[PDB]
Every structure is written in C-alpha cells, then in structure tokens.
Amino acid sequence: MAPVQKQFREFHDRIKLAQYDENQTLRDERDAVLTAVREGLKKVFADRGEAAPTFTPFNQGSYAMNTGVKPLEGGEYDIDVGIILNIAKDDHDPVEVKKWIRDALKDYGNGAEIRRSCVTVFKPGYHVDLAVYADPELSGGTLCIAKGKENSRLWQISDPQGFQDRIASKLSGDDAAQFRRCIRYLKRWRDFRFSSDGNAAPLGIGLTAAAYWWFQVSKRTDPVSQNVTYDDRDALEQFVQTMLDNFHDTWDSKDQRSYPRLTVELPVQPYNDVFEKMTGMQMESFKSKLQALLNALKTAKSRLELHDACKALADHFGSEFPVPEK
Ligand SMILES: O=c1ccn([C@@H]2O[C@H](COP(=O)(O)NP(=O)(O)OP(=O)(O)O)[C@@H](O)[C@H]2O)c(=O)[nH]1
Ligand SMILES: O=c1ccn([C@@H]2O[C@H](COP(=O)(O)NP(=O)(O)OP(=O)(O)O)[C@@H](O)[C@H]2O)c(=O)[nH]1
Structure with missing residues (x-):
C-alpha cells in the first residue's frame, strides 16, 4: 500500500456525502421542494386563468455525479435539481419564468431568490438550487436554462445531463x-x-x-x-x-x-x-x-x-x- 493511502481513504470516509441514489435524507429534502413548487405554481397561475404548466425534474450537481462532500461545521450543503417546464422558450421571458418559481416558493423555509442561473430556496443547514429549463420539444430541440436577474436575461443552451x-x-x-x-x-x-x-x-x-x-x-x-x-x-x-x-x-x-x-x-x-x-x-x-x-x-x-x-x-x-x- 502507497504512503499515506490509509489516511487519504479515512479522510475520504469523513468528507463524503452519499449521492441521491444512496441518500434518503437528500431525496426527501429534494422531493419536499418539488411538491412545494407544484402546489406553489397552482397559486401563481390562478391569476392567469388556466392550469400551471407541468415540469419534469432531474437530479443535478454533486449529489447526481456522486462527488458530494459534507459542509464544514455550521456550513450548508446545496441540493441541485433541474425542472423542465412544459413551455416554449420563445413564448416566455426567462426571468418571468424564474419569477413563477420564486413566487411558487416565496413562503417555503427562509424564502426563495432569483439568481443568474437558478431560483434558490433557503432552509436550515441547506439550500436548493432549481435550474429552470424550457421544453426542448417546444423550443426547437435545444435544452435552454433561464439566465439573468430582474437587475439585468436569456434562454442559454445548457447540457447538465451531458x-x-x-x-x-x-x-x-x-x-x-x-x-x-x-x-x-x-x-x-x-x-x-x-x-x-x-x-x-x-x-x-x-x-x-x-x-x-x-x-x-x-x-x-x-x-x-x-x-x-x-x-x-x-x-x-x-x-x-x-x-x-x-x-x-x-x-x-x-x-x-x-x-x-x-x-x-x-x-x-x-x-x-x-x-x-x-x-x-x-x-x-x-x-x-x-x-x-x-x-x-x-x-x-x-x-x-x-x-x-x-x-x-x-x-x-x-x-x-x-x-x-x-
Ligand atoms: O444547469 C445548471 C446551471 C446552474 N445551476 C445553478 O446555478 C448556480 C450558479 O450560481 P449563480 O450563477 O446562479 N449565482 P449569481 O446570482 O450569478 O451570483 P453573483 O452574480 O456573483 O452575485 C449553482 O448553485 C448551480 O446549482 C444549476 O443548478 N444548474
Ligand atoms: O457553469 C455551469 C455549468 C453547468 N452547471 C450544472 O449545474 C449542475 C451542478 O450545479 P452546481 O453549480 O451546484 N455544481 P456542483 O458539482 O454541485 O458543486 P458543489 O456543490 O461544490 O459540490 C450540473 O448538473 C451541471 O450540469 C452549473 O452549475 N454551472
């Protein structure tokens, strides 16, 4: 066995946080924020006079790639999730679409926020980053993420699963x-x-x-x-x-x-x-x-x-x- 290998593996054991597929707690925190968006979307769309659009969620980031680490003591981890809304990108403003999600989650935990590349929702010891996408089937075959803030704002070509x-x-x-x-x-x-x-x-x-x-x-x-x-x-x-x-x-x-x-x-x-x-x-x-x-x-x-x-x-x-x- 190589020099210091045993101590590297013990360090790894201490810092590793199990991926979605091996981690019930993360799957529950994720799914709770997904539910909160579905319910939240009914509210936002009741003012526009039609069913809220449906979305397909998918795992993103470190807990999808099995590269996750525990935060330092009193730090937060980030649960990353994509939602592909059943919308044509050319029919909607990216910030408008991110606004729907923000307002859907306004009153979940310590509030939501529109970021350059996501809507983030805050809870104790962790946040959830929702990457917001238009339907490729409705948007000329490309997967585009909702980029830009109020203070700024495009549909950018994205490939998280690639x-x-x-x-x-x-x-x-x-x-x-x-x-x-x-x-x-x-x-x-x-x-x-x-x-x-x-x-x-x-x-x-x-x-x-x-x-x-x-x-x-x-x-x-x-x-x-x-x-x-x-x-x-x-x-x-x-x-x-x-x-x-x-x-x-x-x-x-x-x-x-x-x-x-x-x-x-x-x-x-x-x-x-x-x-x-x-x-x-x-x-x-x-x-x-x-x-x-x-x-x-x-x-x-x-x-x-x-x-x-x-x-x-x-x-x-x-x-x-x-x-x-x-
Ligand atoms: O495909 C993607 C792309 C981006 N993201 C999320 O986007 C976040 C990137 O961070 P951000 O670009 O959304 N933050 P920003 O508002 O630009 O900060 P600043 O301008 O300096 O004040 C990360 O936490 C990712 O999880 C995704 O989750 N999926
Ligand atoms: O610039 C980019 C490009 C892509 N992404 C996409 O966003 C997802 C991850 O979002 P992330 O920015 O949180 N990356 P992560 O690996 O979780 O870092 P860390 O939390 O420190 O362990 C991935 O599935 C990527 O496809 C970005 O977030 N930023």
Missing part, C-alpha cells in the same frame, strides 16, 4: 472511484482554505471540470499477486501540478500588470470558462494556495515519520485529515 454523463463515463470501477475521491479532496481543501472570502473560492463545478480535463489514475499492480493498490497522494500531486501548469499570465490594461489565470472550459454546451468570474487577484491567490498544496503533497512523500507526512497534509485539508501520533 456534463453528468462525461463525469460518469471518463473512467470506470475503482479508477472512477479514485477520480471521485480526488474531486472531493479538492472540494474540502476549497472549503477549508477559501473560508475568508467565499467569492474567491473556486466553484465545485470548476474543480470537477478540471478533473475531467487533467486527472490521471495512479495505481500499482504487484508483479506477483497482480493485486492493485491506488496512490491518491500521487494522483493528487500529478493532478495539482497539471492544473498549475495550465495557469497563464494574463495582461490587465487597467492594473498595468499580469495575473495568472486558469481557464477551465465546460466540456459540454455552453463550453464557458467556469472560472471566468474569478478576478485576477483571486486567481493569483488560488494559484499560490494550489502551489502550497502541491508542496505539501511532495513533502508527504519524503517524510520518514507518518505523523509528519499526515500533519503536512492536514495543514491544507483541515480537521478531518487523520494525523497518527509520532
């Missing part, structure tokens, strides 16, 4: 398990080391897309038993180094200097840079913490004391990373 397929299909079996563990490791690193300023934090979807582009399996196959052991520390080292290698100095005419920028395109429509909202200064801070994480992964390979190897990693991963006594 993204989810890409993440599921990149690898299989125990190879795909290491891939998923390494996404979760970086999500906990993100939560632990970007807690000062949430806006500066690399989005979960960006770490997932980065893994899609750049993650490589690390495993060794015994010359005798042919028995296979995974090396998460080495997989993470190679993955982090590859991300660092893809930062590019980018000139900023206002500040008259360069900032290092990591561009991570979604591998499906709309193929946008998921990190495009991060400022140059937030990118410089992201790069420096990634470099510090890389340095710790290399130190952890070289320590004679397992205590010192694990301590070096706990400095970047936080309180759930096991540190054996010296």
